[PDB]
Amino acid sequence: AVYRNIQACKELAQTTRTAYGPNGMNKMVINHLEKLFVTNDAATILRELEVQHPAAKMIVMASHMQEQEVGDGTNFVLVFAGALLELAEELLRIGLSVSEVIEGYEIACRKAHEILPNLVCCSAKNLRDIDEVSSLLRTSIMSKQYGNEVFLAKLIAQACVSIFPDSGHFNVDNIRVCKILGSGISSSSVLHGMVFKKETEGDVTSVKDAKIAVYAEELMNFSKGEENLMDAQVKAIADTGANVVVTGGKVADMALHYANKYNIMLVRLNSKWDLRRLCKTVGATALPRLTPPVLEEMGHCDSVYLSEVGDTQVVVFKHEKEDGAISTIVLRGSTDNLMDDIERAVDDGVNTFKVLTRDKRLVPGGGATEIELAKQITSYGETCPGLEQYAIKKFAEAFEAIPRALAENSGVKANEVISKLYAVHQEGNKNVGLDIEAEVPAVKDMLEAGILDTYLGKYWAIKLATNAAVTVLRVDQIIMAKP
């Protein structure tokens, strides 16, 4: 019952085999909440595509580890692992054992970790400039949202440069993205602090308060008593001194009058996820009752005011006296489906440089370093005696499936690409990757184009991918139990 596990993981790769690269195909994602989505992100497929075959889940948990400590290489987990087991079936057809093949991959993983630093050609300059971040973030824009290589390269760079001076404090949790209905990507902008699209309900312009609190005769008597009840609540807020009150629910017409009576800025936020962002930044939590005057659950902010950017009244929550490391990228888009696809490409770019906060090392992509890595591992496999030759030799051919995906997804023949990728590297022309062109099957230097991946990303992508192929091959039979 071993091949049934290989056929299970083989099918999971063929779905994301086409979503790889910039010319990859989109996916008709039907959400469980009676919603329709269209994208080409491989990470979102598995979240919705419920693969119940537990043999393939080991590859998914490896892809989930590709989200921790790194934010790229998800296709590497599914493609490289899926190609490893496809060729592993060719070995067992001859009559090889499972342990010798596992041990051969355990050795090849150590040989691959030593060749990758040799192929590190260039890296970042560590200047904290906008041209440095935008020029290198072109790799994150690839295969997540094509065509916006110019727009998002500078937009993402503007939010990270504000935090790079805070050495060792750059995080993806500090960059919260917002999206507003608009014409297109041209109306996008970048702002500091937390910016929310909802306008200010009150007529208060600016306030530097730190206290931010997030939340027939008888017929006319109780109707006016409610007006005294609401006034007593804003008076309770005035007793606390909170000039900025963030409302999670609905606001009465009389509350707008009392909010301006005591000079209290009143802001409404219907989105719960936007309210959760305030819990982790200023310290103010959302209380369920009608405005509890709890001075302990109020946050701390140096300045709060209303702004208008792109013809949209938006409230600003920045920190002038403190250091400040929060940035908000406000994108504009007419279609909510495609507008969210851009939101994911932004998170992919923020996390790419979050790993570059460590030792900055980059490797060219596009089939350049993967064949150079497969060319050197094959050299160790030819001279290394013993029965490990069949596993190490095929471990190099597993690296070939990735440029084969870049070839087929680009409409280019897969065999002609690898034949030319091996000829240029036989002559020593390193850093030569496949040129993205539907008509030109030729190749060129990717370093001259400005395509550079993360050295620290390929490490964990090759390790988690090979360890998953070991975990799936060690299990030769799946047996059900009833607790």
Partner: protein
């Protein structure tokens, strides 16, 4: 006779199942729980005690590993393989017309000859650090990916030596197991003291204290009920909060003596104090003790308070009215390590805590629970090596040397009993045959190789899992416990007796 053939063919299938997961070259098996949890493991006891089997007969064999795990904790994989091959060989003799009872007496005679031969192979050498390293490597290899072999070998061995001295009887309760995420699998290490789950929640607590005194208590310092014969005599809601302070007055005064106990017991600088109260503490009470630099913990488990008495020495106090410095413990570098998810307190650097904690680190739960199985399986093998100083060479060296003895053994009980000895000898030889397939070598080449080795002195050869050559298991560092092999000769024969003694099968309401 056809009714007996069912139990034979029933365990034959269970033999083909648990034969591929023996040794490090063997395969793993998955446990599909159906609720959302997946487990990976090699130990046969885990594949049967928690698993439910299709056939009814094989379900009885599952209880053998349940009783076997309580004695030794290992070897359950090889127990079913000996049982599967015994009844496989016995079927060839019953097919000719022999009764099963005659074959059982043959095994009863082979048990003594095989058990008596065990006295010669075992070695009474002194167990030391270099000897147990050979033992831990033999067990943990079958539970990891050939990478955590040297990592966990040094942890399990040092955990045992640090909790047993002067021929003291050892116990497994002294070793606590902990798991943590957001780390790599090769970062497994040991802890001098005990890692606590719930820490302190206040910014004014000392992140790490080089030296602090411990105080064991079970008094809740939160807003508690009334202790004396009184009540809530009030007239409005504002007066209700006034008597809340009265129910807190008995609580607030008890915390003021804690500061007095700290000031009297080393109230000078370069000192510290750490409270280990199991019950909750109010944020106001923590605010009073945090000013003095007292790192007070709350919401701990009952198991840690019992271990805290052994590690720290502070005696549990039930009331602060009887607060005395006699029940004060002591700890070394008391700190709280910051991880990616939560914070956990450490009380390491104790002189003799009589309890260690093997801190396991892994990214996934199925990987974290797999190593948890390797710890308890690797620890008991070393527990059986020290409590029983006699150990034997693995690699099937005991089974092959025993099998060679049974062929050269005359009938000392009965005449036809020799046939069962011929079958019991061919059963023990399945261990080198099983490991030959998991290694990928020829099943027959491995057998005659280790069998062709003869000399005029002690010569116990074994299987080379990597090459297949006949290799000495004693020199390369492979050793097994005396009680493990002892139970195989008693479990496999007693169980195989009960299966062959079944004549007919009747449905009692099924």
């Amino acid at each position: 006779q056809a009714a007996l053939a069912v139990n034979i063919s029933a365990a034959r299938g269970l033999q083909d199942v648990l034969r591929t997961n023996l040794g490090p070259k063997g395969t793993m098996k998955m446990l599909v729980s159906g609720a959302g949890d997946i487990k990976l493991t090699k130990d046969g006891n885990v594949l049967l005690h928690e698993m439910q089997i299709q056939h009814p007969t094989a379900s009885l064999i599952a209880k053998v590993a349940t009783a076997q795990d309580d004695i030794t904790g290992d070897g359950t994989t090889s127990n079913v393989l000996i049982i599967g091959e015994l009844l496989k060989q016995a079927d060839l003799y019953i097919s000719e017309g022999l009764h099963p009872r005659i074959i059982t007496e043959g095994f009863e005679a082979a048990k003594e000859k095989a058990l008596q031969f065990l006295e010669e192979v075992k070695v009474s050498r002194e167990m030391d650090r270099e000897t147990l390293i050979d033992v831990a490597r033999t067990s943990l290899r079958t539970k990891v990916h050939a990478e955590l072999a040297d990592v966990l070998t040094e942890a399990v061995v040092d955990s045992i030596l640090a909790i047993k001295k002067q021929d003291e009887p050892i116990d497994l309760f002294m070793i606590e197991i902990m798991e943590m995420k957001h780390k790599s699998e090769t970062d497994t290490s040991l802890i001098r003291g005990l890692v606590l789950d719930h820490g302190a929640r206040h910014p004014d607590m000392k992140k790490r204290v080089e030296d602090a005194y411990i105080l064991t208590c079970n008094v809740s310092l939160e807003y508690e009920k009334t202790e004396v014969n009184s009540g809530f005599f009030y007239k409005s809601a504002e007066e209700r909060e006034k008597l809340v302070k009265a129910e807190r007055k008995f609580i607030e005064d008890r915390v003021k003596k804690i500061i007095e106990l700290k000031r009297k017991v080393c109230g000078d600088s370069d000192k510290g104090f750490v409270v280990i109260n199991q019950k909750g503490i109010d944020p106001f009470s923590l605010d009073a003790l945090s000013k003095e630099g007292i790192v007070a913990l709350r919401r701990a488990k009952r198991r840690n308070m019992e271990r805290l008495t052994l590690a720290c020495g502070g005696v549990a106090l039930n009331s602060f009215d009887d607060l005395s410095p006699d029940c004060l413990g002591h700890a070394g570098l008391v700190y709280e390590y910051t991880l990616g998810e939560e914070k956990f307190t450490f009380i390491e650097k104790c002189n003799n805590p009589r309890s260690v904690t093997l801190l396991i680190k892994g990214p996934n739960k199925h990987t974290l629970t797999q190593i948890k199985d390797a710890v308890r399986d690797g620890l008991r093998a070393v527990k059986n090596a020290i409590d029983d100083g006699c150990v034997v060479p693995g690699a099937g060296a005991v089974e092959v040397a025993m099998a060679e003895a049974l062929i050269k053994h005359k009938p000392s009980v009965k005449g036809r009993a020799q046939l069962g000895v011929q079958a019991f000898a061919d059963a023990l030889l399945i261990i080198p045959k099983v490991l030959a397939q998991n290694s990928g070598f020829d099943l027959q080449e491995t057998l005659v190789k280790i069998q062709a080795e003869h000399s005029e002195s002690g010569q116990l050869v074994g299987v080379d899992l990597n090459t297949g050559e006949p290799m000495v298991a004693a020199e390369v560092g492979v050793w097994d416990n005396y009680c493990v092999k002892k139970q195989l000769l008693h479990s496999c024969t007693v169980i195989a007796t009960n299966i062959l003694l079944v004549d007919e099968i009747m449905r009692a309401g099924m």
